[PDB]
Amino acid sequence: PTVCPCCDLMLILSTHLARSYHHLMPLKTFAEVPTTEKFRSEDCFSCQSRFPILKNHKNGKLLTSSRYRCEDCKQEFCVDCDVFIHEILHNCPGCESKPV
């Protein structure tokens, strides 16, 4: 994007406009799921990687499970998708798969 040198008008593109919509409305952070809460799925939503047993110690069981529930669509995500949806992407696949 540059200002027009002949009529002093700013010349941008739609992608240049859209690069800042995530700064205008950001994604709410994904919530850490409770260990005792009933788990909806064994695999990620947009990634379908396994959520493993994650037994930190002998009696840990499902302590600090790698699911990251979204506040709106209530869909669980892995740690890689949790980083990726909040950093590189800027939109929730569960929130868009929700048929409002």
Q: Which residues bind Zn ion (CB under 5 A)?
A: 44, 47, 49, 70, 72-73, 78, 81, 92, 94-95
User: What number of H helices and E strands is found in the chain?
Assistant: 4, 4
Residue number with CB closer to another protein (23 or 38): 23
* Alpha-carbon distances, residue 24 vs 15, 19, 27 (angstroms): 15, 10, 10
Cβ-based burial of 7 (10 A; exposed 0-12, middle 13-18, buried ≥19): exposed
Q: Which is nearer to Zn ion, 44 or 62 (CB)?
A: 44
Q: From the CB of 78, what's the least distance to Zn ion, in Å? A: 4
Those residues whose C-beta lies under 8 Å from the C-beta of residue 82, and which sit 6 or more positions away, are 30, 68
Residue 63 contact, options another protein, Zn ion, none, Cβ 5-8 Å cut-off depending on partner type = none
- Site membership for another protein, residue 47 (CB under 8 A): yes
Q: Which does 43 bind (CB under 5 to 8 A by kind): another protein, Zn ion, none?
A: another protein
